[PDB]
Design a protein around this nucleic acid. Structure first.
Ligand SMILES: [Zn+2]
Ligand SMILES: [Zn+2]
Ligand SMILES: [Zn+2]
Ligand SMILES: [Zn+2]
Lengths: 72, 73
DNA sequence: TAAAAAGTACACGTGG
DNA sequence: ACCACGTGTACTTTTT
Protein backbone atom coordinates (compact mmCIF):
# COMPACT_ATOMS: atom_id res chain seq x y z
CA UNK A 1 0.00 0.00 0.00
CA UNK A 2 1.29 3.41 -1.14
CA UNK A 3 0.95 7.02 0.06
CA UNK A 4 -1.14 8.80 -2.52
CA UNK A 5 0.93 11.96 -1.99
CA UNK A 6 4.54 10.67 -2.26
CA UNK A 7 4.36 6.89 -3.05
CA UNK A 8 6.31 5.94 0.06
CA UNK A 9 4.79 3.15 2.18
CA UNK A 10 1.37 4.19 3.42
CA UNK A 11 0.71 4.24 7.16
CA UNK A 12 -3.07 4.52 7.18
CA UNK A 13 -6.10 6.60 6.19
CA UNK A 14 -5.05 9.97 7.55
CA UNK A 15 -7.19 13.11 7.29
CA UNK A 16 -9.16 11.41 4.57
CA UNK A 17 -6.38 9.99 2.42
CA UNK A 18 -4.16 6.95 2.37
CA UNK A 19 -0.78 8.52 3.25
CA UNK A 20 2.50 7.84 5.00
CA UNK A 21 3.40 9.12 8.42
CA UNK A 22 5.66 11.87 7.13
CA UNK A 23 2.97 13.24 4.80
CA UNK A 24 0.38 12.98 7.58
CA UNK A 25 2.48 15.05 9.94
CA UNK A 26 3.46 17.35 7.10
CA UNK A 27 -0.13 18.19 6.19
CA UNK A 28 -1.22 18.80 9.78
CA UNK A 29 1.75 21.13 10.13
CA UNK A 30 1.10 22.98 6.89
CA UNK A 31 -2.57 23.75 7.57
CA UNK A 32 -2.17 24.51 11.29
CA UNK A 33 0.46 27.14 10.67
CA UNK A 34 1.53 30.36 9.01
CA UNK A 35 3.20 28.51 6.11
CA UNK A 36 4.05 30.59 3.04
CA UNK A 37 5.81 28.09 0.80
CA UNK A 38 7.28 29.03 -2.59
CA UNK A 39 7.92 26.68 -5.53
CA UNK A 40 11.25 27.20 -7.38
CA UNK A 41 9.87 25.70 -10.59
CA UNK A 42 6.42 25.81 -12.08
CA UNK A 43 4.08 24.77 -9.24
CA UNK A 44 4.28 21.27 -10.81
CA UNK A 45 7.09 19.47 -8.98
CA UNK A 46 7.48 15.73 -8.67
CA UNK A 47 6.61 14.46 -5.17
CA UNK A 48 8.21 11.10 -4.36
CA UNK A 49 9.99 9.79 -1.30
CA UNK A 50 13.12 11.88 -1.91
CA UNK A 51 11.86 14.89 -3.83
CA UNK A 52 8.94 15.56 -1.44
CA UNK A 53 11.38 17.39 0.84
CA UNK A 54 12.35 19.70 -2.04
CA UNK A 55 9.05 21.60 -2.55
CA UNK A 56 6.64 21.82 0.36
CA UNK A 57 4.50 24.10 -1.78
CA UNK A 58 3.84 21.40 -4.33
CA UNK A 59 3.64 18.65 -1.67
CA UNK A 60 0.96 20.61 0.22
CA UNK A 61 -0.94 21.43 -2.98
CA UNK A 62 -0.85 17.74 -3.75
CA UNK A 63 -2.04 16.91 -0.24
CA UNK A 64 -5.06 19.10 -0.88
CA UNK A 65 -5.91 17.99 -4.41
CA UNK A 66 -5.68 14.49 -2.96
CA UNK A 67 -8.44 15.56 -0.56
CA UNK A 68 -6.70 15.78 2.78
CA UNK A 69 -8.63 17.87 5.30
CA UNK A 70 -8.45 18.17 9.08
CA UNK A 71 -12.22 17.56 9.43
CA UNK A 72 -13.53 14.04 8.76
CA UNK B 1 26.62 49.20 -5.47
CA UNK B 2 27.21 45.79 -3.87
CA UNK B 3 28.73 42.52 -5.08
CA UNK B 4 26.37 39.72 -6.15
CA UNK B 5 26.78 35.95 -5.75
CA UNK B 6 27.04 34.41 -9.20
CA UNK B 7 25.19 31.29 -8.02
CA UNK B 8 22.21 32.83 -6.19
CA UNK B 9 22.40 36.70 -6.43
CA UNK B 10 22.61 37.19 -2.67
CA UNK B 11 25.28 39.69 -1.68
CA UNK B 12 28.67 38.03 -2.16
CA UNK B 13 31.34 38.12 0.51
CA UNK B 14 34.37 37.30 -1.61
CA UNK B 15 35.78 35.06 -4.26
CA UNK B 16 35.41 31.43 -3.03
CA UNK B 17 36.70 28.33 -4.83
CA UNK B 18 37.31 30.44 -7.91
CA UNK B 19 34.00 32.29 -8.05
CA UNK B 20 32.36 35.40 -6.57
CA UNK B 21 29.82 33.94 -4.10
CA UNK B 22 27.91 34.54 -0.86
CA UNK B 23 29.11 32.79 2.31
CA UNK B 24 26.20 30.34 2.08
CA UNK B 25 27.15 29.13 -1.37
CA UNK B 26 30.82 28.89 -0.36
CA UNK B 27 30.07 26.33 2.32
CA UNK B 28 27.30 24.66 0.30
CA UNK B 29 29.74 23.85 -2.49
CA UNK B 30 32.41 22.57 -0.16
CA UNK B 31 29.88 20.27 1.50
CA UNK B 32 28.56 19.01 -1.82
CA UNK B 33 32.00 18.24 -3.28
CA UNK B 34 33.33 16.48 -0.18
CA UNK B 35 30.22 14.60 0.83
CA UNK B 36 28.40 12.04 -1.29
CA UNK B 37 24.87 13.40 -1.63
CA UNK B 38 21.91 12.05 -3.62
CA UNK B 39 20.55 15.28 -5.09
CA UNK B 40 17.53 15.05 -7.38
CA UNK B 41 15.61 17.90 -8.96
CA UNK B 42 11.84 17.75 -8.62
CA UNK B 43 11.38 20.20 -11.47
CA UNK B 44 13.14 20.29 -14.82
CA UNK B 45 16.70 20.98 -13.67
CA UNK B 46 16.17 24.73 -14.12
CA UNK B 47 14.84 25.75 -10.76
CA UNK B 48 15.19 29.36 -9.66
CA UNK B 49 18.15 29.68 -7.30
CA UNK B 50 17.87 32.97 -5.36
CA UNK B 51 18.19 33.82 -1.68
CA UNK B 52 14.59 32.74 -1.07
CA UNK B 53 14.58 29.51 -3.04
CA UNK B 54 18.13 28.19 -2.94
CA UNK B 55 17.20 25.67 -0.22
CA UNK B 56 14.52 24.09 -2.39
CA UNK B 57 16.78 22.36 -4.97
CA UNK B 58 20.33 21.43 -3.98
CA UNK B 59 20.71 19.60 -7.25
CA UNK B 60 20.16 22.75 -9.28
CA UNK B 61 22.19 24.84 -6.87
CA UNK B 62 25.15 22.51 -7.21
CA UNK B 63 24.83 22.44 -10.99
CA UNK B 64 24.94 26.24 -11.03
CA UNK B 65 28.00 26.19 -8.74
CA UNK B 66 29.71 23.96 -11.23
CA UNK B 67 28.62 25.88 -14.27
CA UNK B 68 29.96 28.98 -12.67
CA UNK B 69 33.35 27.34 -12.32
CA UNK B 70 33.63 26.59 -8.63
CA UNK B 71 36.41 24.13 -8.00
CA UNK B 72 38.07 22.94 -4.87
CA UNK B 73 41.58 23.59 -6.13
C1' DT C 1 49.08 45.39 11.12
C1' DA C 2 45.65 43.88 7.49
C1' DA C 3 42.68 42.04 3.75
C1' DA C 4 41.31 37.97 1.34
C1' DA C 5 40.35 33.21 1.25
C1' DA C 6 40.22 28.90 3.44
C1' DG C 7 39.04 26.19 7.24
C1' DT C 8 36.07 25.28 11.48
C1' DA C 9 32.10 25.25 14.67
C1' DC C 10 27.56 26.62 16.82
C1' DA C 11 22.64 27.66 16.44
C1' DC C 12 18.71 27.11 13.93
C1' DG C 13 14.59 25.15 11.25
C1' DT C 14 12.34 21.42 8.79
C1' DG C 15 11.35 16.83 8.58
C1' DG C 16 10.39 11.98 9.98
C1' DA D 1 7.80 14.75 22.98
C1' DC D 2 12.93 13.59 20.45
C1' DC D 3 17.06 13.31 17.13
C1' DA D 4 19.08 13.54 12.38
C1' DC D 5 20.21 16.46 8.76
C1' DG D 6 20.88 20.61 5.79
C1' DT D 7 21.82 25.24 6.22
C1' DG D 8 23.91 29.89 7.24
C1' DT D 9 26.45 32.97 10.27
C1' DA D 10 30.38 33.90 12.68
C1' DC D 11 34.51 32.87 14.21
C1' DT D 12 39.78 31.25 13.57
C1' DT D 13 43.57 30.03 10.68
C1' DT D 14 46.29 30.49 6.69
C1' DT D 15 47.67 33.23 3.16
C1' DT D 16 49.32 37.37 0.62
ZN1 LIG E 1 3.84 10.33 1.72
ZN1 LIG F 1 7.26 22.98 -6.73
ZN1 LIG G 1 24.84 32.47 -3.14
ZN1 LIG H 1 15.88 21.83 -9.57
Amino acid sequence: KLCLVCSDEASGCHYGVLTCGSCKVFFKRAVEGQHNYLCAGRNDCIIDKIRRKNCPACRYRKCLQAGMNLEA
